[PDB]
């Protein structure tokens, strides 16, 4: 569903931009609701499904949202920032999922870790590219992420 959404242009009306951002926000909240069911259903096939379709969702978020955020940033900045801080909340869950698949050394899970990792790093760097093309490149901060499990701990 989410791959079929097209980014517009700056020549397009702001109403279509606003409805597209609402449409993206709906997809992100649905993705978070779907991903959060991992914690109570831990098994081989449910983890396999979210590992494959998580990266397939993030790649669609990369190809067909980020041009819309590049277009509509000077007008709708708060929506874009809210969208990104919403997407971070399950990107973190995907990172913990990759960790969980490494720790319990499960081959059938671990085969989908490196392309997911590459895709989340692409997401970070693409956000930096967004701020570069919107002339706020010196606002892009970074910082490490605490190593949690699926429930949420600090495994150390």
């Amino acid at each position: 569903t989410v791959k079929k959404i097209e980014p517009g242009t700056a020549a397009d009306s702001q109403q279509i931009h606003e409805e597209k951002l609402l449409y993206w926000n709906m997809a992100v909240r649905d993705f978070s609701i779907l991903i959060n069911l991992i914690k109570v259903f831990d098994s081989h096939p449910v983890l396999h499904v979210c590992l494959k379709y998580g990266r397939l969702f993030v790649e669609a978020f990369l190809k067909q949202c980020m041009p819309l955020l590049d277009f509509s940033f000077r007008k709708h900045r708060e929506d874009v920032l809210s969208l990104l801080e919403t997407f971070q909340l399950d990107t973190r869950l995907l990172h913990h999922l990759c960790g969980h698949s490494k720790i319990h050394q499960d081959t059938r899970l671990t085969q989908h870790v490196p392309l997911l990792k590459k895709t989340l790093e692409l997401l970070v760097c693409r956000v930096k590219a967004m701020l570069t093309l919107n002339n706020c490149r010196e606002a892009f901060w970074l910082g490490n992420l605490k190593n949690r499990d699926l429930q949420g701990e600090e495994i150390k």
């Binding site: 970070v124 590219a129 992420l145």
Partner: protein, 882 residues
């Protein structure tokens, strides 16, 4: 399989580390030529496949990239194997040699959109081996002649060299060719005219020395009348005649009395033979102007050049009677009336301002080159006449003063617009032999009878730096194309003799006179004659090793094996570089040092890699890098490249990479802003200025070459499944450069190509480790293993490299210190790639470590820490911007 064999052999010969481990197995090239050698026992089902392999190899891998090393050197070598297979098949199987020859001729004719140089080499080899066999293809050859107006000039000029053993034998085909060429002269396409002159000059050349001789002396006198058409045609068609007549006279002597007449009448349309009319040449008839289209026709300079050369040849070899005794007086009158012409006679410098938009400026610019060429020919002629008479050397100096006046007038007029006028850099009409015998007489004549006349030329330094520059232009012209311009200009033995006799004088002037004797200032310090002799030495040393590669024995005899002579020639430049380095600091000669390093680089390739002279050379270079500071960056880059090119042929250069990384770490800083390091003691040519963009990229490039060799070893090991020394060597190499990568990861590199090349070489490092692990998967499942080497390497990769990669990535991203929008978007989408590619390569290393850890019953994942991951934030800087 043949191209992979050649890439194996090149990469295996490139390094000593690979030759220590691998004992050389037979390559697929020598197998296929063994097959052709063994086909004499004549099972002839094979031979059709050998012909088809040979044509596949020549078709696919012909020079079309060449209208490098990776795409160049294993794709000349496959094409030469193809022509070699076809020629060896031809020299054995007498049945085949009508379907080889037709297939070659089918590719020479229908093509010549694509390059066909390899096919015209194969055709020449085939024909020169057995010229009778072209009588079997008399049908197909005569239907190539009907298209010898549409082919380009290079095809025609070499196909007609090949064919003519038919035309000595045949008579009908000869009278077909002359008919084709005579009807081709009246074409409209440009190539047809020059193809016709190439055919006429070849038929004049090799079709008798003087069948019946009475059936030749008239027959060339037929062709010669046909050539009086071409002299009426346009400039390029003339110029091919003016350059060809000297070879025609050399190979066919008795045409001399005709040929000179053909020139002399051609001179008389442009020479005004009345004294006290001051411009002695008619340059207003050598310019064709119609419809605002301005063209040069009848290049008078090359005509005088050809007249001079044929005249000197006639005087030299024929005589031991009226045309040449006239021509001496013609050239002498041209000399004496050219001396006392002061540029108002050619309407120059004051009535003209040489503007290349107006027709008059273009005309004046053409006539300028004309008068410069005329003066050059007369310089050569006045040198030729007398055995060092003082009057004619003053004449030479006055002619050169006229030449230099026109030259610096064109320099003043080229100082306003862009420097695209490469027509001023048009080749001199001095023959290579003359510039040899002029520089020899200028720098190495001590005979007291000559010395009074030579002191006229040695007094004027501009003449010296003209007559050196001209020989530099000649050797540069041999570098670019395989032949030089003048007479005996395509005859490689004469070019070798003149390169030996240029080397002998340039070495003498560089050696016997240093650079510190100068009295000249900065303007002439940029172009001091010692420096130009060193530059010509650098171009000669380079251009011998391309072409005169078997003769590098004899070339050194001109100046005991190749190594002793090369070492003795190395030591002079070695001492000269030491004297230039150690002495001065203030404003030291960057250019002279830089191309001394270039000379030593070109010279070090002739030493044998196990010789003691090679070892003392490498030791000297290492000591120079260990001692001297030398703040200039390009000179440092040239020295390190010389050091690495010396070092990799001796042993694997990973300890040197480690030491240079430690010096970069010591110099540039550190990520954490508080770690105290300094280890300058290793290598002295490393500065705050130098090491950051220059030594960093160079050491990373050498790391990539080490990783390529290691990956090739691993891929070869994966073929088989003898083993244990190879794996120990691989693991030792990988551990060393793992320490190397560690020091550069921690370093505070600049935000340019240095950080990007590091990230790309880290992906290449991890990929190589991933390929090692994935090889160990294949072995350790069979027996039980991962010996202590591999475990220690995994431990080292987990402890030292990986978490530092993570902190380095955080350093790169956190560091943040007018844009066309499309290119800006292209830039940022380029820059979003190499960090993800490094993350992928790390995670795919760890995943194959998991695979190995499962199916070996040893937990290699207990060494590495949990993967660190990164989240972004955005701060309150956006309120300042918007």
């Amino acid at each position: 399989s043949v191209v992979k064999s050649f890439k194996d052999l090149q990469l295996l010969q490139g390094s000593k580390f690979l030759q220590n481990l691998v004992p050389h197995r037979s390559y697929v090239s020598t197998m296929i030529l063994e097959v052709v050698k063994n086909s004499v026992h004549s099972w002839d089902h094979v031979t059709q496949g050998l012909v088809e392999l040979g044509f596949i190899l020549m078709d696919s891998y012909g020079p079309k990239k060449v209208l490098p090393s990776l795409s160049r050197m294993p794709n000349q070598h496959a094409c030469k194997l193809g022509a070699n297979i076809l020629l060896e098949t031809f020299k054995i199987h007498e049945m085949i040699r009508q379907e080889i020859l037709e297939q070659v001729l089918n590719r020479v004719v229908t093509r010549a959109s694509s390059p066909i140089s390899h096919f015209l080499d194969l055709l020449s080899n085939i024909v020169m081996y057995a010229p009778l066999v072209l009588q079997n293809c008399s049908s197909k050859v005569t239907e190539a002649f009907d298209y010898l107006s549409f082919l380009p000039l290079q095809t025609v000029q070499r196909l007609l060299k090949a064919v003519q053993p038919l035309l000595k034998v045949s008579m009908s085909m000869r009278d077909c060719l002359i008919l084709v060429l005579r009807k081709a002269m009246f074409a409209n396409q440009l190539d047809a005219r020059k193809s016709a002159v190439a055919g006429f000059l070849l038929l004049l050349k090799n079709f008798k020395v003087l069948y019946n001789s009475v059936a030749n002396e008239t027959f060339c006198l037929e062709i010669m009348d046909s050539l009086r058409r071409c002299l009426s045609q346009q400039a390029d068609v003339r110029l091919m005649l003016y350059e060809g007549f000297y070879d025609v006279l050399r190979r066919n002597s008795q045409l001399a009395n005709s040929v000179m007449q053909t020139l002399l009448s051609q001179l008389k349309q442009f020479y005004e033979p009345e004294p006290d009319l001051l411009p002695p040449l008619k340059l207003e008839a050598c310019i064709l102007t119609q419809g605002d289209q301005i063209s040069l026709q009848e290049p008078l300079d090359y005509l005088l050049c050809c007249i001079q050369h044929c005249l000197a040849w006639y005087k030299n070899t024929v005589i031991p009677e009226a045309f040449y005794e006239d021509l001496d007086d013609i050239l002498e009158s041209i000399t004496n009336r050219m001396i006392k012409s002061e540029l108002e006679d050619f309407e120059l410098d004051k009535s003209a301002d040489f503007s290349q938009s107006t027709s008059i400026g273009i005309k004046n610019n053409i006539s300028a080159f004309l008068v410069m060429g005329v003066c050059e020919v007369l310089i050569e002629y006045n040198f030729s006449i007398s055995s060092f008479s003082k009057n004619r050397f003053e004449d030479i100096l006055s002619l050169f003063m006229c030449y230099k006046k026109l030259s610096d007038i064109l320099n003043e007029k080229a100082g306003k617009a862009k420097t695209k006028m490469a027509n001023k850099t048009s080749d001199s009409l001095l023959s290579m032999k003359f510039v040899s015998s002029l520089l020899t007489a200028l720098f190495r004549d001590s005979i007291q009878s000559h010395q009074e006349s030579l002191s006229v030329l040695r007094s004027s330094n501009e003449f010296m730096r003209y007559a050196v520059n001209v020989a530099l232009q000649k050797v540069q012209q041999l570098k670019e194309t395989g032949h030089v311009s003048g007479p005996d200009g395509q005859n490689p033995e004469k070019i070798f003799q003149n390169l030996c006799d240029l080397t002998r004088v340039l070495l003498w002037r560089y050696t016997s006179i240093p650079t510190s004797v100068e009295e000249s200032g900065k303007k002439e310090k940029g172009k001091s004659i010692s420096l130009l002799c060193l530059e010509g030495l650098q171009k000669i040393f380079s251009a011998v090793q391309q072409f005169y590669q078997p003769k590098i024995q004899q070339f050194l005899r001109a100046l005991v094996s190749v190594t002793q002579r090369t070492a003795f020639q190395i030591r002079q430049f070695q001492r000269s570089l030491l004297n230039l380095l150690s002495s001065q600091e203030e404003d030291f000669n960057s250019k002279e040092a830089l191309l001394l390093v270039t000379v030593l680089t070109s010279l070090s390739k002739l030493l044998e890699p196990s010789s003691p002279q090679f070892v003392q050379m490498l030791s000297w270079t290492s000591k120079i890098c260990k001692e001297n500071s030398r703040e200039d960056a390009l000179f440092c880059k040239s020295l390190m490249n010389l050091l690495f090119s010396l070092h990799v042929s001796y042993k694997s250069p990973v300890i040197l990479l480690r030491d240079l990384s430690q010096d970069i770490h010591g110099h540039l800083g550190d990520i954490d802003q508080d770690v105290e390091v300094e280890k300058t003691n290793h290598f002295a040519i490393v500065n705050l200025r130098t090491a950051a963009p220059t030594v960093c990229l160079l050491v990373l490039s050498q790391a990539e070459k080490v990783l390529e060799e290691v990956d090739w070893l691993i891929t070869k090991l994966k073929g088989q499944v003898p083993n244990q020394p190879v794996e120990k060597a691989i693991i030792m190499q990988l551990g060393t450069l793992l320490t190397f990568f560690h020091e550069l990861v921690q370093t505070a590199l600049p935000s340019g190509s240095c950080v990007d090349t590091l990230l790309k070489d880290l992906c290449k490092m991890y990929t190589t480790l991933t390929a090692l692990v994935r090889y160990y998967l294949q072995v350790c499942q069979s027996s039980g293993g991962i010996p202590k080497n591999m475990e220690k390497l995994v431990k080292l990769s987990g402890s030292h490299l990986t978490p530092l990669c993570y902190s380095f990535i955080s350093y790169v991203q956190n560091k943040s210190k007018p844009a066309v929008v499309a290119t800006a978007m292209a830039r940022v989408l380029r820059e979003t790639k190499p960090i993800p590619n490094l993350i992928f390569a790390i995670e795919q290393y760890e995943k194959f470590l998991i695979h190995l850890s499962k199916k070996s019953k040893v937990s290699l994942m207990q060494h590495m820490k949990l993967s660190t991951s990164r989240d972004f934030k955005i701060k309150g800087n956006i309120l300042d911007m918007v």
